[PDB]
């Protein structure tokens with residue numbers, strides 16, 4: 001899958017804080033809606 | 036005439052010896068209720084195969100030539116090519132139809148049971164309680180004589196038309212449903228469920244609107260959602276059996292299952308439970324609506340006893356398979372712990388070191404994967420590490436060493452690591468019957484802080500955000516604050532940490548309460564230098580978003596001033612596209628104008644969506660379901676034609692794939 005979807009640069013891989021404008025209650029037992 | 040015999044349906048002397056127990060468990064009963072349950076279960080499985088099992092999405096899951104990392108229970112299991120998978124799903128659909136219509140019941144039950152369990156064991160990422168329940172119900176119904184009433188086999192065979200069935204056929208199903216209810220209730224006797232933490236935000240739904248007339252929102256989320264669920268589980272287990280309390284139990288079960296169907300997207304679980312609810316009535320209820328023991332006798336009793344004991348034992352068998360143990364217990368799917376734990380992942384870093392040059396690089400978090408359950412189990416992490424270790428040589432990487440750093444919090448706790456970030460998972464040791472040595476323990480001692488943290492969550496402004504971190508001694512965290520995230524501060528809550536700025540190589544040791552303002556656009560490190568775990572917090576705001584929002588607000592205010600008649604002076608050329616709304620015959624607009632127009636269009640779309648009648652939504656839902664079913668049928672037909680009569684030229688294949696993907700209209 002090319003070298004842009006498999007590898008990340010040092011600056012982009014250590015960005016710990018990602019804000020909004022870029023739920024978090026994953027309950028496992030919920031089928032993923034996909035058609 | 037004894038009271039015990041009237042309540043429980045059997046006398047004590049029936050349990051005195053083995054022969055009397057076998058005689059009791061093989062008494063004749065009416066087959067109507069079992070037939071109705073079989074029909075409903077078959078219909079629901081027929082409807083469920085093309086929706087949740089993945090018959091429509093099968094052409095983008097097992098695509099040939101794609102290198103994906105699978106998560107099967109056993110490494111020996113491998114998926115077949117796509118056409119044979121479609122054949123397997125066709126066989127499963129035929130078996131479900133045969134179970135629904137009662138045509139060749141045993142063969143149909145086998146043809147549904149075997150492929151279903153093959154699919155279930157082929158992937159551990161799609162395990163849930165309601166699929167384990169379907170598998171168990173099919174396994175139970177394989178042996179039961181459910182085809183003696185209201186079935187095609189009765190019309191085509193006189194010997195199996197309105198015949199008697201043993202009582203253990205009903206006993207096994209009743210015991211299974213009771214075990215589901217009671218084990219769910221006793222698993223919900225957790226410290227995170229009796230206190231209102233798990234599923235805390237479910238009281239804001241409109242279905243709980245009447246409860247708000249007499250109670251507050253917090254009392255609604257504590258009394259009704261949490262304690263009511265446990266009480267309803269235990270009471271639904273016990274009340275449906277007795278004749279006095281069966282009606283109230285049926286009403287409560289029906290209300291609870293309808294509300295669960297509407298609130299969640301579990302699928303057909305609520306409908307299957309509703310269909311299994313009337314099994315506790317007399318075995319001849321559907322009829323009034325219209326108007327020396329041998330070998331098998333002992334085998335049935337032995338099967339009933341052993342199966343019920345195994346179903347009781349399995350949810351608590353986590354002390355034997357200690358390899359799958361984690362912060363929670365065991366793999367998800369067969370413990371009946373539904374909606375008890377919630378996870379919010381913050382950051383996942385995958386580092387690789389080449390074994391020939393020594394270079395250090397970073398991989399994408401979820402590459403070569405189709406699910407995101409590998410962040411919480413050691414076995415799936417080991418499988419993913421092996422998959423990456425065998426796939427990376429295709430990208431000019433020699434024998435790699437892979438390290439993982441995953442942050443996760445359960446039920447609104449501190450964000451902490453789950454796996455040791457200094458251990459090569461490729462060469463790590465893992466066995467199913469021994470505890471893993473590279474799983475960090477949960478900081479359970481930091482339980483009460485979940486109160487205090489919430490206070491800080493109320494003290495913030497409308498744009499500030501906060502992230503709470505708990506770290507182990509010895510370890511360190513390396514972070515890169517982006518250029519946009521100006522005004523980022525770090526405060527220490529408990530313990531001792533050292534913060535190092537790498538631009539000038541300067542580190543300061545922070546004590547409790549101290550606050551620091553970290554640089555934006557540079558790298559920093561947090562080392563833990565205390566014998567105990569240290570808890571701190573990141574408080575940050577996005578400066579670029581704030582400036583953009585202020586500029587957009589100023590632009591909207593200027594537009595409103597133009598609209599209301601003020602600002603008699605000539606408009607700026609940049610304001611002209613705001614009034615016109617179309618960039619035709621002019622220069623390209625600034626990104627601010629494009630952003631404002633996009634936001635206005637999105638708001639208009641949201642308002643239009645809100646102002647939508649119910650019947651249009653129902654029609655769209657029906658059209659979407661029809662499209663799913665049609666795509667499933669067409670893809671299955673194409674695959675079967677490829678299998679039987681061979682594969683045509685690429686032009687015809689492309690034409691057929693284009694036709695199968697067409698919207699109904």
Ligand SMILES: *[C@@H]1O[C@H](CO)[C@@H](O[C@@H]2O[C@H](CO)[C@@H](O)[C@H](O)[C@H]2NC(C)=O)[C@H](O)[C@H]1NC(C)=O
Pocket residue numbers: 499522523524574575576
């Ligand atoms: C950056 O620091 C915080 C957010 O990270 C904010 O500072 C607050 O400053 C306002 C100014 O009056 C106070 O009302 C708040 O109480 C402060 N919040 C605290 C102390 O938690 C603000 O976004 C930025 N402040 C500066 C000085 O740049």
Ligand SMILES: *[C@@H]1O[C@H](CO)[C@@H](O[C@@H]2O[C@H](CO)[C@@H](O)[C@H](O)[C@H]2NC(C)=O)[C@H](O)[C@H]1NC(C)=O
Pocket residue numbers: 509533535540541542562564
């Ligand atoms: C800032 O303080 C930290 C606190 O330990 C220093 O880190 C240690 O880093 C050195 C590398 O020079 C290692 O040899 C030690 O083993 C580390 N300590 C522990 C406990 O692991 C760091 O070097 C300091 N930075 C500067 C520029 O002096």
Ligand SMILES: *[C@@H]1O[C@H](CO)[C@@H](O[C@@H]2O[C@H](CO)[C@@H](O)[C@H](O)[C@H]2NC(C)=O)[C@H](O)[C@H]1NC(C)=O
Pocket residue numbers: 017018019020021022517519520577579580583630
């Ligand atoms: C901080 O807020 C800004 C607000 O603009 C976010 O920025 C946008 O970033 C996305 C990247 O996902 C771009 O596609 C948009 O074009 C940006 N908007 C612009 C330039 O107006 C940003 O992602 C947020 N997070 C960080 C870490 O900066």
Ligand SMILES: *[C@@H]1O[C@H](CO)[C@@H](O)[C@H](O)[C@H]1NC(C)=O
Pocket residue numbers: 003429430431
């Ligand atoms: C290096 O890798 C790239 C893509 O991963 C590709 O050109 C080839 O596999 C390698 N090329 C050379 C010259 O080693």
